[PDB]
Amino acid sequence: QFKDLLLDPLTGDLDFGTPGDRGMRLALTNQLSLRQRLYLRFAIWAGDWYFDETFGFPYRTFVGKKTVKAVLDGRIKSEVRQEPDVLQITDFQSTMDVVSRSYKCFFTVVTAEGEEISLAFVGEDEYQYPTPPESNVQLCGDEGVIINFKNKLYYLINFRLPK
């Protein structure tokens, strides 16, 4: 439920929205929040962000060196579980090509969805305060009491005659 500015999954810029409803949006669904929380966590190289030297991933250790596939997978699979709301990791297809020296892995992560605790900070309210009456209706009655009775009588006259 971690709120934050929404990042476009397709381009990487802020998700200002479609041309018909351009604006700014907050990440509300846990899925969207977790997506960008993993994306930033994996995209920032370790130590390259000032104000926090411990954040990021240490790509320099592996890239450019002769490395064992098994060691890399452990670190990749470990960084994911640093988020407190990750249920499990389903599958992991780690493959390496020696000709091009490229490495490419696949996997998915499962996360549940929570409640909103309070709507005070977001948009709307859930209550239905009453509406003041109109004109002399309060002190003298209402005509609808006649209309509903007339309709009931008419429908009952309709019911008895077979159709």
Binding site: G47, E53, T54, A70, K77, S78, Q82, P84, Q88
Partner: protein
């Protein structure tokens, strides 16, 4: 020393500090999840206790199996008091029960025979390439996480079932005698003892309470700035709070 050496010094602080953050945050994640339970199947799996191994879903109920368990033991203890009498003898008084202790020894091999995916150790182990999957290593970082997070473990032994046991120590020996495997020993002892319906809740206590630290009045004590308002519904609020609440001055 040299300006270049300052960069080398900085690396020590960062990498050493970053190491504990990964360990510390992971431990903090434990003790926060209460919908997770850990169970260890010391023995009995192939005799009757198979019924309990089927109930675990790899997501919130987890099973720990070992490639081999050499021995396990269970010993409860009691204390007896004694006072002296004028007859040059000793009598006895009430007695007490001293919880209980459990220990076992096992081994995790880098060449497994029975690779059951339901076991939580074999979550990611490769079926056809076991020795490169690093099974012996993969067991240490999961066993250590359980112990250092103070989980209440449940042991499913063939003879009986034990609950509310806390790990106290463990060992890992890569002696040259066997190799390609780790000898593991563990000890446990019995740790014998908000939300929820208002009906079931009873009168609680919190003791003396000072000013809340998340809002104003602490800033005046901490000598900080009050947070400006976001404008919405101006000229309606300001008239009322300023008259009914005032400002800290």
């Amino acid at each position: 020393i040299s300006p270049a050496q300052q960069a080398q010094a900085d690396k020590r602080a960062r990498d050493a500090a970053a190491a504990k953050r990964k360990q510390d945050t992971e431990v903090s994640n434990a003790k926060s999840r209460e919908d997770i339970q850990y169970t260890m199947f010391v023995s009995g799996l192939r005799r009757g206790r198979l019924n309990e191994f089927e109930r675990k879903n790899r997501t919130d109920d987890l099973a720990i199996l070992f490639d081999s368990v050499t021995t396990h033991t269970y010993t409860k203890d009691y204390n007896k008091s004694s006072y002296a009498v004028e007859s040059k003898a000793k009598a006895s008084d009430h007695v007490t029960t001293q919880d209980g202790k459990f220990t076992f020894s096992g081994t995790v091999t880098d060449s497994p025979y029975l690779i059951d995916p339901r076991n939580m150790i074999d979550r990611d182990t490769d079926k056809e390439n076991p020795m490169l999957a690093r099974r012996p290593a993969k067991a240490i970082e999961i066993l250590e996480l359980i112990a250092d997070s103070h989980q209440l473990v449940t042991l499913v032994t063939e003879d009986n079932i034990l609950s509310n046991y806390v790990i106290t120590s463990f060992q890992v020996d890569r002696s040259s005698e066997a190799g390609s495997s780790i000898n593991v020993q563990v000890t446990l002892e019995e740790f014998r003892f908000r939300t929820s319906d208002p009906k079931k809740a009873k009168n609680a206590n919190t003791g003396t309470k000072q000013t809340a630290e998340d809002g104003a009045v602490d800033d005046s004590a901490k000598q900080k700035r009050q947070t400006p308002y976001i404008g919405k519904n101006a000229e309606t609020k300001e008239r009322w709070e300023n008259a009914a609440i005032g400002t800290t001055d």
